[PDB]
Amino acid sequence: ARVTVQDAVEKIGNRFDLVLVAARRARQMQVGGKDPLVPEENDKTTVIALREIEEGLINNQILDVRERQEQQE
Amino acid sequence: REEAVVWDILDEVIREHPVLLNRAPTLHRLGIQAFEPVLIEGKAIQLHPLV
Amino acid sequence: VTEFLKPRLVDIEQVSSTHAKVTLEPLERGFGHTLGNALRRILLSSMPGCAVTEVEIDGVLHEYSTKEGVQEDILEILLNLKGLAVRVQGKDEVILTLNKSGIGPVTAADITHDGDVEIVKPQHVICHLTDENASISMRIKVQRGRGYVPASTRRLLVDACYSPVERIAYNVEAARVEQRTDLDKLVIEMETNGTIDPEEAIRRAATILAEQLEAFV
Amino acid sequence: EFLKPRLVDIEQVSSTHAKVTLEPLERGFGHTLGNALRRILLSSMPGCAVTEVEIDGVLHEYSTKEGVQEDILEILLNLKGLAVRVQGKDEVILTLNKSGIGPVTAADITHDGDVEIVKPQHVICHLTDENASISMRIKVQRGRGYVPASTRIPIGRLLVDACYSPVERIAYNVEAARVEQRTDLDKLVIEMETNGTIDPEEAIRRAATILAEQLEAFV
Amino acid sequence: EIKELLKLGDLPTSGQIRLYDGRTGEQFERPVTVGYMYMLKLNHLVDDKM
Amino acid sequence: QDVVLGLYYMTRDCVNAKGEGMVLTGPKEAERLYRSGLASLHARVKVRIT
Amino acid sequence: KPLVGTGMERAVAVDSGVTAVAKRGGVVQYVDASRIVIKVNEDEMYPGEAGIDIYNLTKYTRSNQNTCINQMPCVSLGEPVERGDVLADGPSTDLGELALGQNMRVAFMPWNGYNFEDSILVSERVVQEDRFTTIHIQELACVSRDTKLGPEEITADIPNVGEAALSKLDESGIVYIGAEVTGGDILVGKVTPKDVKDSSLRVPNGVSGTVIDVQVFTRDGVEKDKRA
């Protein structure tokens, strides 16, 4: 369940990077095959993506770390 | 055919998917907003009152 | 033709011990309000319970009054004595004491135990005493009754709220079944005073009502 | 230790409607049982309305039968309120056969053993020719609530709406009683308006059966 | 003339009746206007617009 | 439009209704007074708010 | 009837052409949904071409806006009538007045937000008593075009469908009078040679109803099938 995205704006301040970062992560969970880091509530991948933004464990930096790390591997 | 199993499928594709409502003479940028559906036995869009 | 959709409560999403939130799903179309009201007017107005009726002060024989040592007035002390929730055993009435001196808040724990009088919330602040020689002393009378009996209907005449509930409400939202069009989902939300847990006070509300229908079914 | 109500008197003020009395009541249960019993009696009572009329020479509900002054559809709106009582069945097929110039009232129906028309003066349609006669087969079945013609599930079967509701108007009044040196009690007087097919004791008993059955959910 | 015609009926003069709420079963404060209005259905029905 | 009429009817006062000048321990028994009918929806009352 | 009228209702319902105004007053001889037969008094009666009057009422036929113009008799058998009176109430007319909608018990109170801006809230009594239940009539054409590659047949031999399509047709391929179709059923079978492609008339989506009448028109030069 997700009603507003005010916490996500308070972690990613731009509010226009939120759609790009959360879209990229939601691609990495849907057709990226990867498993989420927060437990889902039979939700779609979008609410899981913003829901992981508001926890403090996904932004653009973490995605740089993981994609460069799999580019090494 | 509108079988019996398609409606739980439909409740499992609504749940977190927005739609865009639009009144036809759109003046300002609140003229298009986005909601989440709740299914209605009926034929009319039930819009939130304050909005 | 006779078989309705008899429900059972699917969840009790309860916040802390005096709070509860009972759902009931699903109910036949229109049965949201015939139970949400019938449990409302029985919980709110006619429930067996025990509460404070009247208090007399040792040196005060007037409602609009004053006293040294306690900064909250006698007009203000009766609000705490309304919310003083006491469960009582089979005594129909019993009188209590509050003889205490000292500095600081006088909670509900400073009443003597005295048999059947149990204090469910001992920490409930009744009055503050600010002086070292200030001494408070009063007779307070609990009584057994069946609903909100005010002071104007009935020593100081205090409002008698015998009923264990404080807040009840219900919000009939729709709830679908497999191929049924629309039904109800009774959402009973209740906060008590703490003399009884709120899972049981609903189960005393139907207990009163099913007795009322006994000469019919 | 609350008191208990009993059915103290059923004054049958007319054949259509009547007044029952619930007495005594503690102060506060009067509007509780009054609103609750009003709501149950209007919502859910077992009725016996017509369901599926099958006139003989008539193809569909929009044609006309030759020699009757009304359309087939106004015949359907006259039959829609044909108040009838059945006892030991659920469905039943009635048959109306009437010739001759004159009105076709409800008494022109075959008077099968448990099926009883309750209002014989009820007009259906008027015949207007010497040698002309409607001949229909009327299917009455039991039910509950309101089932429209769309939401259910040859060609001569005309489907009408079902209007399964014996009562029409409920009104109740609380007032004081004088039982035994004890004031502030309540007398509930439930004034129902029935089309004639349910006895008021049966209604006021089935209603509390429905409510006390609904309280099985948590006691 | 409306007031005297209502006096011929057994109805209140002001055209307002105390009404009881259907859900809760209690009297509305401030008795409401009731009466019979002639109302129309237009052919802008909803199963042409959808 | 309707909701401000409901609020404007809810927060006002008349000078003499039931429960005039009685003290109330919180908003919860203000709801409990109004739902029963011992008070009126608008009659002036000292309360303890937090 | 309108409870609160003006008195211009009589002049509109008479002066429009929807009611069956009696041309000569007399005694009603026969009343039927189809026709009303009026026997004439002796004063307004011609010596030659004497006879009586016969009014053929207009039954259920399509209006221009897909409503149902209808005429129903408002006099009974054996009743005196006067020159200039109504005999058949048309659409939206009752006993010679003009009655457009229906009049209902209305309250003026804001009821739980279900009438927020300008809405209306209607009880189940109004829908149960069938009193706004309007009757519409739609007219569905199905033409038989002479194109390239071959003419079009109106046969029932349709591929890609089973007995659910052909259950509601006769052997000619047109639906019966009064077979209650729904959305998706096939009214007129029609195939176009290509082996051959289905082009049959189908009920438009979302409507119900009863086939009340079937017209068949035929170009002079085509032999007729059995149903025509």
UniProtKB/Swiss-Prot annotation, chain A:
Biological process per Gene Ontology, one example term: intracellular iron ion homeostasis
Keyword set, alphabetical order: DNA-directed RNA polymerase, Nucleotidyltransferase, Transcription, Transferase
Enzymatic reactions: RNA(n) + a ribonucleoside 5'-triphosphate = RNA(n+1) + diphosphate
GO-annotated cellular components: cytosol; cytosolic DNA-directed RNA polymerase complex; RNA polymerase complex; transcription elongation factor complex
Molecular function terms, GO-annotated: bacterial-type RNA polymerase core enzyme binding; DNA binding; DNA-directed RNA polymerase activity
UniProt keyword Oxidoreductase present: no
EC number assigned by the record: 2.7.7.6
Family: Belongs to the RNA polymerase subunit omega family.
Summary of the function given for this chain in its UniProt record: Promotes RNA polymerase (RNAP) assembly. Latches the N- and C-terminal regions of the beta' subunit thereby facilitating its interaction with the beta and alpha subunits. Part of the processive rRNA transcription and antitermination complex (rrnTAC). The complex forms an RNA-chaperone ring around the RNA exit tunnel of RNAP. It supports rapid transcription and antitermination of rRNA operons, cotranscriptional rRNA folding, and annealing of distal rRNA regions to allow correct ribosome biogenesis.
Protein name per UniProt: DNA-directed RNA polymerase subunit omega
Lineage of the species this protein comes from: Bacteria, Pseudomonadati, Pseudomonadota, Gammaproteobacteria, Enterobacterales
Originating gene: rpoZ
From-to range in the entire protein, with total length: 2 to 74 of 91
Swiss-Prot record, chain D:
PTM text: (Microbial infection) ADP-ribosylated on both alpha subunits by the phage T4 protein ModA. ADP-ribosylated on only one of the alpha subunits by the phage T4 protein Alt.
GO cellular component: cytoplasm; cytosol; cytosolic DNA-directed RNA polymerase complex; membrane; transcription elongation factor complex
Catalysed conversion reaction: RNA(n) + a ribonucleoside 5'-triphosphate = RNA(n+1) + diphosphate
Enzyme Commission code(s) on record: 2.7.7.6
BP GO annotations: bacterial-type flagellum assembly; bacterial-type flagellum-dependent cell motility; cell motility; cellular response to cell envelope stress; DNA-templated transcription initiation; intracellular iron ion homeostasis; nitrate assimilation; regulation of DNA-templated transcription elongation
Effect listed in the UniProt record for changing residue 178 to C: In rpoA101; temperature-sensitive
Enzyme class at the top of the EC tree: transferase
Region (Alpha N-terminal domain (alpha-NTD)): 1-219
Result for mutant: residue 39 to C: In rpoA112; temperature-sensitive, blocks RNA polymerase assembly
Keyword list, A-Z: Acetylation, ADP-ribosylation, DNA-directed RNA polymerase, Nucleotidyltransferase, Transcription, Transferase
GO molecular function: DNA binding; DNA-directed RNA polymerase activity; protein dimerization activity
UniProt remark on domains: The N-terminal domain is essential for RNAP assembly and basal transcription, whereas the C-terminal domain is involved in interaction with transcriptional regulators (such as CRP) and with upstream promoter elements.
Family from the record: Belongs to the RNA polymerase alpha chain family.
Organism: Escherichia coli (strain K12)
From Swiss-Prot, chain E:
Practical applications according to UniProt: Co-administration of salinamide and rifampicin or salinamide and myxopyronin suppresses the emergence of resistance to both antibiotics.
Domain of life (superkingdom): Bacteria
Modification(s) after translation: Acetylated on several lysine residues in the presence of glucose.
List of residues that carry N6-acetyllysine: 7
Assembly and oligomerization: The RNAP catalytic core consists of 2 alpha, 1 beta, 1 beta' and 1 omega subunit. When a sigma factor is associated with the core the holoenzyme is formed, which can initiate transcription. The rRNA transcription and antitermination complex (rrnTAC) consists of RNAP, NusA, NusB, NusE (rpsJ), NusG, SubB, ribosomal protein S4, DNA and precursor rRNA; S4 is more flexible than other subunits. In pull-down experiments interacts with CedA.
Role of this protein: DNA-dependent RNA polymerase (RNAP) catalyzes the transcription of DNA into RNA using the four ribonucleoside triphosphates as substrates. Resistance to the antibiotics salinamide A, salinamide B, rifampicin, streptolydigin, CBR703, myxopyronin, and lipiarmycin can result from mutations in this protein.
Similarity comment: Belongs to the RNA polymerase beta chain family.
Protein name from the UniProt record: DNA-directed RNA polymerase subunit beta
Complete-protein stretch covered: 1194 to 1243 of 1342
Swiss-Prot record, chain F:
Subunit architecture: The RNAP catalytic core consists of 2 alpha, 1 beta, 1 beta' and 1 omega subunit. When a sigma factor is associated with the core the holoenzyme is formed, which can initiate transcription. The rRNA transcription and antitermination complex (rrnTAC) consists of RNAP, NusA, NusB, NusE (rpsJ), NusG, SubB, ribosomal protein S4, DNA and precursor rRNA; S4 is more flexible than other subunits.
Membership in a protein family: Belongs to the RNA polymerase beta' chain family.
PTM comment text: Acetylated on several lysine residues in the presence of glucose.
Recorded superkingdom: Bacteria
Shown stretch of the complete protein: 504 to 553 of 1407
Protein name, entry field: DNA-directed RNA polymerase subunit beta'
Function (record text): DNA-dependent RNA polymerase (RNAP) catalyzes the transcription of DNA into RNA using the four ribonucleoside triphosphates as substrates. Resistance to the antibiotics salinamide A, salinamide B, rifampicin, streptolydigin, CBR703, myxopyronin, and lipiarmycin can result from mutations in this protein.
Practical use: Co-administration of salinamide and rifampicin or salinamide and myxopyronin suppresses the emergence of resistance to both antibiotics.
